[PDB]
Amino acid sequence: PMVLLECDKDIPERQKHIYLKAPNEDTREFLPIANAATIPGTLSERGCAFCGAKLVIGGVLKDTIQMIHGPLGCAYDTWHTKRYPTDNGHFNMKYVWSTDMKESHVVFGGEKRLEKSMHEAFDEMPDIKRMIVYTTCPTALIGDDIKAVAKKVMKDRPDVDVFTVECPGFSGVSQSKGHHVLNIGWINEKVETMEKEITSEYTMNFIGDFNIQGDTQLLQTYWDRLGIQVVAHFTGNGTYDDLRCMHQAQLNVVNCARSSGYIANELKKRYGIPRLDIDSWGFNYMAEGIRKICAFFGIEEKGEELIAEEYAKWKPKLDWYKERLQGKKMAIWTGGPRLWHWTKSVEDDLGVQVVAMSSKFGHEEDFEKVIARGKEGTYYIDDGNELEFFEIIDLVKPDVIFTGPRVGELVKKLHIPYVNGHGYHNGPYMGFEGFVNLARDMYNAVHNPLRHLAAVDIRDKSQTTPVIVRGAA
Amino acid sequence: SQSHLDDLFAYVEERCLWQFFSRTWDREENIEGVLNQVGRLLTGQEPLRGTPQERLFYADALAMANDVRERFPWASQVNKEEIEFLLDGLKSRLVDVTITRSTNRELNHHLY
Amino acid sequence: AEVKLSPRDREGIINPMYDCQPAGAQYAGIGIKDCIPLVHGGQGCTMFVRLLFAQHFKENFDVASTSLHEESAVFGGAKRVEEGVLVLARRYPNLRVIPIITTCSTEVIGDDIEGSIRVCNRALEAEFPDRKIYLAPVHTPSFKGSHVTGYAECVKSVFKTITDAHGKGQPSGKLNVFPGWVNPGDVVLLKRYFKEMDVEANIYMDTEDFDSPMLPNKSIETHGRTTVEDIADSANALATLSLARYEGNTTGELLQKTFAVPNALVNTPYGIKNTDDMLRKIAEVTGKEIPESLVRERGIALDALADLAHMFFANKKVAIFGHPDLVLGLAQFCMEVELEPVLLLIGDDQGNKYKKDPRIEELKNTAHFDIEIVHNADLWELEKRINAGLQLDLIMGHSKGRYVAIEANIPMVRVGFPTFDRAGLYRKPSIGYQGAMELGEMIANAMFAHMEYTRNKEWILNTW
Ligand code: CLF
Ligand SMILES: [Mg+2]
Ligand SMILES: [Mg+2]
């Protein structure tokens, strides 16, 4: 049924956002409302639309200036917070740019301030010739026309290319709006503005993977082995110009259908490129994915050789962790997709029971997926808040929670260990080896002497301090 | 036939993603495309592999056909007509739950 | 030799040194017991700052958003403020203080915060008759100043609000102390100094418990310790000691103007002399003697630093960035130990104030090497100067500068805020005598490791 938590008695609309799956229910009658307005004052986990454009997607690129048109805080706030390495010395994580909007620009306009800042950026780093310009709350409110500024700069500096995104933080309800605006602008303006050499009979784009701790580089070892050219990664370890070539691919492979399904759908509509959704987390899921790709291409034997070698390498370790993790209870409190990518894969491959899940910004489509895959007796929460999190912990008593670091530091006080569900502990977590990495971190998190020590009150004469026995795969 | 159909439906719900595409018209296309190829594969017919979309439907259907043959001993015992009937039932169930009765408010939005 | 002040010469920023005003206001607020700040703006303005505090402290701090969305951008956001205050109050029965912090969005659209406060005060009075919640309007447009200015503004507004409600009472005998934006370890040190000097004092804000235990009973103790009652008693103090010109002195000035509590602003107590001068001021206002224990801690510091100064520090060139009170104070500490702070970077638009800071004169009359002080600086200004050939032996600054030092192969000591890329720094003092010693030691140890990694006379670390 839908659940009214005790902590929500004064915000009882929240009942329509929380589903407890019970036997025999028709789940079509219990789909949480999702992607609706936030309730003020709740300590919702949600971020802003600008975040979804710049931090999540655009900022992943290795060769592009990220010009945030606004006051300096939006820039500071999206710098030193992500874990998306590159093969060029991590230029993306080392720098952030701002137009340093001042009061006089609010009053008189910021377009000349933006134009100046853009030329300065290109002057300070003469090897960088690509730029994305984002609006933020106040530059949207004052109506600066960043597309027109961009056009002027490209006329004045014919060796650069500039893309613009209108994504002030108040647009939409969450990060999700930023994903949408960026995806549709990119396909409308920049796809099919360049071409590259095709070097394989088999070509794909990999859409919706942001190279968290090297996930994309790990998957790339698969595609290289298989002889598949990846025209563009959207956007892990990617380049601006690769993204201009997306129309050349034969196949679009989608992992993050939330952030990046938009561009896959438009590529299909406009260019006829088929969309294949996979799960690139999960051990048996990764095998299915590879088999689908290879069947599409007609390279089935090459796929089976890769799969066999990966299972010989990694399956014994995975099974060693399953033996120790079987029956453990997990919660997943992340953006959305990882709920449906992980609930059944950790169950199948590790024996882990996901007892509660919360999505900051997922849509009803994400809830359809996760409820389809998820267990009975589990809580499914759209746009969860802090008090709810406490009440859920008391209801389900998880052994481990996969969530962001701040919430991890909070639940630590309850002696519940965490794994960073967003930026990982010791990743990558995608692919065959990655799921073993995920399992190892779950195991170390749970089978941790400090947890046991923290429970002991040294004043209690009836209590001793225990000694715990760990293992390694 | 009801228990067999219940088996197929529980499989697709817990495993597959193609029935959960972003819009109604994509769900409809995928339910029909993939399940037609599943029927071919389960009954020994040559799959369609002409166009890029047919090739993708084959790839999705091959995972399901192989899984169904592994999981369900009945799928190797029933005849071609019974397979076809089941898959028609499965199409109608998947439309029902992913389209007709889904409360996903984005399903009919004309723009992606 | 010249100490020159110059502005950044670019309009735009690359690698900002500070966050915006609302972030500093949030920081102020999380030091108050039973306080949840409410940030009136878009959601990122809250969530990104809660993350920043988790990076620095490795703790969660409660801050709520009004969740400004598109409708409010067209018609105004007051209903979001008013809903947010009530939803906080209804769901957090022990909540006492809500600083209502504006952002760029809500400054631009002009929402009437004081009007919303009147509405909310009426609603709260009616719904919760036996409760008092203090709503403080905090005007923090992000398009001026920085998180330094925002911290100062929030402290002042909170103090105004709570003291307006309670007024002047019976003399407390206590000092008010505004240390500015310091670590829990700095607060621990000051508490110790006041205890050793038998001086009763409230430290605003008392953030010692941000370093909270993991307890057998599972309780959460990660809270500010400064209460309403402590803030209200400010009006009754003997004196205010303000340690940071840009981080609280304006509240000491407000309490002087309103309640005739005399405010004494001193140099922020980085290094030996500034600590000496602080303690002399305390003695002067309280009539209490400096204790022997502080003479001994000072002497232990001096002894430790004397093992370092002429051997490892002399003539070494240092760049320092961070809050203005920290940068100016650390430059003075560096010179006491024979380091040469040749580049000081201060990261906001308050240059017209900084040109009048007396510590600049104090540098001008002591330094024997040219010093460049870049105001309105970003961290690209440091990188660019290194790339143009500035030879540095040491950088002192916060963790968002780390890649400058890493790539230039220059040792870096992490000071100020945020220091996320090393463990435990929030617990170590940087001010006072113990702090000077710990800073000096961090410097030396950073140098020593550098010598080892680079094979630069690494054999010398034996009989120093
Ligand atoms: S919801 Fe998102 S992060 Fe917030 S402002 Fe808006 S785009 Fe940006 Fe920016 S400068 Fe500071 S952090 Fe805000 S108050 Fe403005
Ligand atoms: Mg089922
Ligand atoms: Mg000694």
Short mmCIF file of N, CA, C and O in Angstrom, two decimals, chain C residues 68-136:
data_model
loop_
_atom_site.label_atom_id
_atom_site.label_comp_id
_atom_site.label_asym_id
_atom_site.label_seq_id
_atom_site.Cartn_x
_atom_site.Cartn_y
_atom_site.Cartn_z
N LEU C 68 12.62 27.00 -4.45
CA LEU C 68 12.10 27.93 -5.45
C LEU C 68 11.97 27.18 -6.80
O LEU C 68 12.92 26.56 -7.27
N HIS C 69 10.79 27.24 -7.43
CA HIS C 69 10.58 26.64 -8.71
C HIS C 69 10.02 27.72 -9.72
O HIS C 69 10.06 28.89 -9.40
N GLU C 70 9.66 27.31 -10.93
CA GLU C 70 9.38 28.29 -11.95
C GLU C 70 8.22 29.27 -11.65
O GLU C 70 8.32 30.45 -11.96
N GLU C 71 7.19 28.78 -10.98
CA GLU C 71 6.04 29.60 -10.65
C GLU C 71 6.40 30.80 -9.76
O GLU C 71 6.05 31.98 -9.96
N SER C 72 7.30 30.50 -8.80
CA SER C 72 7.76 31.52 -7.88
C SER C 72 8.66 32.52 -8.58
O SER C 72 8.76 33.70 -8.20
N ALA C 73 9.40 32.09 -9.61
CA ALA C 73 10.21 33.04 -10.38
C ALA C 73 9.43 34.04 -11.15
O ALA C 73 9.97 35.07 -11.50
N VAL C 74 8.16 33.74 -11.49
CA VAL C 74 7.27 34.61 -12.23
C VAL C 74 6.41 35.46 -11.31
O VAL C 74 6.25 36.67 -11.59
N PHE C 75 5.93 34.87 -10.20
CA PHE C 75 5.02 35.54 -9.32
C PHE C 75 5.53 35.93 -7.91
O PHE C 75 4.85 36.59 -7.16
N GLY C 76 6.73 35.53 -7.57
CA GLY C 76 7.40 35.76 -6.28
C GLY C 76 7.29 34.46 -5.44
O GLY C 76 6.42 33.61 -5.59
N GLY C 77 8.21 34.40 -4.49
CA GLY C 77 8.48 33.23 -3.69
C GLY C 77 8.07 33.28 -2.27
O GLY C 77 8.42 32.37 -1.51
N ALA C 78 7.40 34.33 -1.85
CA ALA C 78 7.02 34.39 -0.43
C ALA C 78 6.27 33.16 0.15
O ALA C 78 6.52 32.72 1.29
N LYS C 79 5.37 32.52 -0.63
CA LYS C 79 4.65 31.40 -0.15
C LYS C 79 5.60 30.19 0.12
O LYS C 79 5.30 29.37 0.92
N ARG C 80 6.70 30.13 -0.60
CA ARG C 80 7.71 29.08 -0.37
C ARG C 80 8.42 29.27 0.95
O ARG C 80 8.66 28.28 1.68
N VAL C 81 8.72 30.50 1.33
CA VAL C 81 9.34 30.84 2.66
C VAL C 81 8.42 30.47 3.74
O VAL C 81 8.71 29.80 4.73
N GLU C 82 7.14 30.87 3.58
CA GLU C 82 6.18 30.70 4.63
C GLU C 82 5.83 29.23 4.83
O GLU C 82 5.81 28.74 5.98
N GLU C 83 5.71 28.46 3.74
CA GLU C 83 5.52 27.05 3.87
C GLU C 83 6.75 26.42 4.50
O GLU C 83 6.59 25.56 5.37
N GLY C 84 7.92 26.78 4.06
CA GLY C 84 9.13 26.14 4.60
C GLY C 84 9.29 26.34 6.11
O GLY C 84 9.69 25.37 6.79
N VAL C 85 9.01 27.58 6.57
CA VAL C 85 9.10 27.81 8.05
C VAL C 85 8.14 26.89 8.80
O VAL C 85 8.48 26.27 9.82
N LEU C 86 6.84 26.81 8.31
CA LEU C 86 5.91 25.96 9.03
C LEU C 86 6.22 24.48 8.97
O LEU C 86 5.99 23.74 9.93
N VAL C 87 6.65 24.01 7.80
CA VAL C 87 7.01 22.59 7.66
C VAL C 87 8.21 22.25 8.60
O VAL C 87 8.22 21.17 9.17
N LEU C 88 9.17 23.17 8.70
CA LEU C 88 10.26 22.99 9.71
C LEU C 88 9.70 22.92 11.12
O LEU C 88 10.00 21.99 11.88
N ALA C 89 8.91 23.88 11.48
CA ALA C 89 8.43 23.92 12.82
C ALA C 89 7.57 22.73 13.23
O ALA C 89 7.58 22.21 14.38
N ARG C 90 6.75 22.26 12.26
CA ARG C 90 5.87 21.11 12.50
C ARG C 90 6.57 19.80 12.65
O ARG C 90 6.14 18.94 13.39
N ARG C 91 7.71 19.68 11.99
CA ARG C 91 8.42 18.39 11.92
C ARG C 91 9.65 18.31 12.81
O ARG C 91 10.06 17.20 13.10
N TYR C 92 10.08 19.48 13.35
CA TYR C 92 11.21 19.55 14.26
C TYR C 92 10.73 20.27 15.52
O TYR C 92 10.87 21.49 15.65
N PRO C 93 10.16 19.49 16.47
CA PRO C 93 9.53 20.16 17.64
C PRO C 93 10.50 20.91 18.56
O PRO C 93 10.10 21.73 19.34
N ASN C 94 11.79 20.58 18.48
CA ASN C 94 12.77 21.29 19.30
C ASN C 94 13.45 22.48 18.62
O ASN C 94 14.24 23.15 19.18
N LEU C 95 13.09 22.76 17.38
CA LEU C 95 13.65 23.88 16.64
C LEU C 95 13.33 25.19 17.33
O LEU C 95 12.16 25.46 17.66
N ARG C 96 14.33 26.03 17.45
CA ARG C 96 14.25 27.39 18.08
C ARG C 96 14.62 28.54 17.21
O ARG C 96 14.15 29.62 17.44
N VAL C 97 15.55 28.33 16.21
CA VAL C 97 16.05 29.46 15.45
C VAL C 97 16.09 29.07 14.01
O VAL C 97 16.57 28.02 13.65
N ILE C 98 15.57 29.97 13.16
CA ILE C 98 15.61 29.79 11.71
C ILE C 98 16.10 31.09 11.13
O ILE C 98 15.38 32.05 10.89
N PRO C 99 17.38 31.18 10.73
CA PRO C 99 17.89 32.26 9.88
C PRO C 99 17.30 31.96 8.48
O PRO C 99 17.44 30.87 7.95
N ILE C 100 16.64 32.96 7.93
CA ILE C 100 16.04 32.92 6.60
C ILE C 100 16.97 33.65 5.68
O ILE C 100 17.10 34.85 5.73
N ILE C 101 17.70 32.88 4.90
CA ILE C 101 18.88 33.33 4.14
C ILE C 101 18.48 33.53 2.68
O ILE C 101 18.01 32.54 2.03
N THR C 102 18.68 34.69 2.14
CA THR C 102 18.32 34.92 0.78
C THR C 102 19.47 34.49 -0.13
O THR C 102 20.60 34.21 0.31
N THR C 103 19.15 34.38 -1.42
CA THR C 103 20.10 33.99 -2.41
C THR C 103 20.08 34.95 -3.58
O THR C 103 19.25 35.92 -3.60
N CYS C 104 20.91 34.73 -4.63
CA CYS C 104 20.80 35.56 -5.80
C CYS C 104 19.34 35.61 -6.33
O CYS C 104 18.87 36.69 -6.67
N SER C 105 18.68 34.48 -6.48
CA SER C 105 17.33 34.48 -7.07
C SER C 105 16.36 35.33 -6.32
O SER C 105 15.61 36.10 -6.92
N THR C 106 16.33 35.20 -5.00
CA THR C 106 15.32 35.81 -4.20
C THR C 106 15.66 37.27 -3.90
O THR C 106 14.75 38.07 -3.57
N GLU C 107 16.95 37.66 -3.94
CA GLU C 107 17.34 39.06 -4.00
C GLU C 107 16.86 39.71 -5.33
O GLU C 107 16.32 40.82 -5.29
N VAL C 108 17.11 39.05 -6.46
CA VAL C 108 16.69 39.63 -7.70
C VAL C 108 15.21 39.80 -7.76
O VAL C 108 14.82 40.93 -8.12
N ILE C 109 14.45 38.79 -7.37
CA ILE C 109 13.01 38.98 -7.49
C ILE C 109 12.42 39.81 -6.36
O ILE C 109 11.20 40.18 -6.44
N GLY C 110 13.16 40.13 -5.35
CA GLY C 110 12.65 41.08 -4.36
C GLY C 110 11.65 40.56 -3.37
O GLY C 110 10.83 41.32 -2.88
N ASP C 111 11.71 39.30 -3.00
CA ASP C 111 10.75 38.81 -2.08
C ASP C 111 10.92 39.56 -0.75
O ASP C 111 12.02 39.87 -0.31
N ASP C 112 9.81 39.85 -0.11
CA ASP C 112 9.76 40.66 1.14
C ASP C 112 9.93 39.71 2.32
O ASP C 112 8.95 39.18 2.86
N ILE C 113 11.18 39.53 2.74
CA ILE C 113 11.46 38.57 3.77
C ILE C 113 10.87 39.03 5.13
O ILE C 113 10.33 38.16 5.87
N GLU C 114 10.99 40.29 5.44
CA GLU C 114 10.50 40.77 6.73
C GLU C 114 8.97 40.63 6.78
O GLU C 114 8.38 40.26 7.80
N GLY C 115 8.30 40.85 5.62
CA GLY C 115 6.83 40.64 5.57
C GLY C 115 6.48 39.19 5.79
O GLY C 115 5.49 38.88 6.50
N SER C 116 7.23 38.29 5.15
CA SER C 116 6.98 36.85 5.42
C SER C 116 7.25 36.42 6.85
O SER C 116 6.50 35.63 7.40
N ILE C 117 8.23 37.02 7.47
CA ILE C 117 8.48 36.80 8.87
C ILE C 117 7.29 37.23 9.76
O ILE C 117 6.93 36.51 10.69
N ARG C 118 6.71 38.39 9.42
CA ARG C 118 5.50 38.76 10.21
C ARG C 118 4.38 37.74 10.10
O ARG C 118 3.71 37.41 11.10
N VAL C 119 4.12 37.26 8.87
CA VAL C 119 3.14 36.24 8.66
C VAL C 119 3.45 34.98 9.44
O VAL C 119 2.61 34.41 10.14
N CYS C 120 4.72 34.54 9.32
CA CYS C 120 5.10 33.37 10.03
C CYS C 120 5.08 33.47 11.58
O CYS C 120 4.66 32.51 12.27
N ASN C 121 5.44 34.63 12.06
CA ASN C 121 5.39 34.83 13.52
C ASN C 121 3.94 34.71 13.99
O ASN C 121 3.67 34.02 14.98
N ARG C 122 3.01 35.34 13.26
CA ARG C 122 1.58 35.16 13.64
C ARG C 122 1.15 33.74 13.58
O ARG C 122 0.46 33.23 14.47
N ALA C 123 1.48 33.01 12.52
CA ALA C 123 1.06 31.63 12.37
C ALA C 123 1.64 30.74 13.45
O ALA C 123 0.95 29.87 14.00
N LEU C 124 2.93 30.94 13.72
CA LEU C 124 3.61 30.13 14.77
C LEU C 124 3.08 30.39 16.17
O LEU C 124 2.96 29.45 16.91
N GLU C 125 2.76 31.65 16.43
CA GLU C 125 2.17 32.02 17.74
C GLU C 125 0.85 31.36 17.97
O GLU C 125 0.50 30.90 19.09
N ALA C 126 0.06 31.27 16.85
CA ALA C 126 -1.27 30.67 16.97
C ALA C 126 -1.18 29.15 17.09
O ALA C 126 -1.90 28.53 17.77
N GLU C 127 -0.25 28.52 16.28
CA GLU C 127 -0.24 27.06 16.18
C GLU C 127 0.55 26.41 17.36
O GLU C 127 0.21 25.30 17.78
N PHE C 128 1.55 27.13 17.90
CA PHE C 128 2.49 26.58 18.92
C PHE C 128 2.59 27.60 20.08
O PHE C 128 3.52 28.29 20.27
N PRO C 129 1.52 27.71 20.88
CA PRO C 129 1.46 28.80 21.89
C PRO C 129 2.59 28.80 22.92
O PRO C 129 3.06 29.88 23.38
N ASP C 130 3.09 27.62 23.22
CA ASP C 130 4.15 27.56 24.23
C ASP C 130 5.55 27.48 23.69
O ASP C 130 6.48 27.07 24.37
N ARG C 131 5.71 27.83 22.44
CA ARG C 131 7.00 27.80 21.77
C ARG C 131 7.36 29.14 21.28
O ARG C 131 6.54 29.93 20.91
N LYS C 132 8.65 29.44 21.29
CA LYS C 132 9.18 30.61 20.67
C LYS C 132 10.24 30.24 19.63
O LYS C 132 11.17 29.53 19.94
N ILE C 133 9.98 30.63 18.39
CA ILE C 133 10.94 30.41 17.29
C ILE C 133 11.38 31.74 16.83
O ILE C 133 10.58 32.61 16.46
N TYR C 134 12.72 31.94 16.69
CA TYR C 134 13.29 33.20 16.33
C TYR C 134 13.64 33.12 14.82
O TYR C 134 14.42 32.30 14.40
N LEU C 135 12.99 33.95 14.03
CA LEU C 135 13.19 34.05 12.60
C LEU C 135 14.03 35.28 12.31
O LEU C 135 13.65 36.42 12.58
N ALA C 136 15.24 35.07 11.77
CA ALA C 136 16.17 36.14 11.49
C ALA C 136 16.31 36.36 9.99
O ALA C 136 16.67 35.42 9.28
#
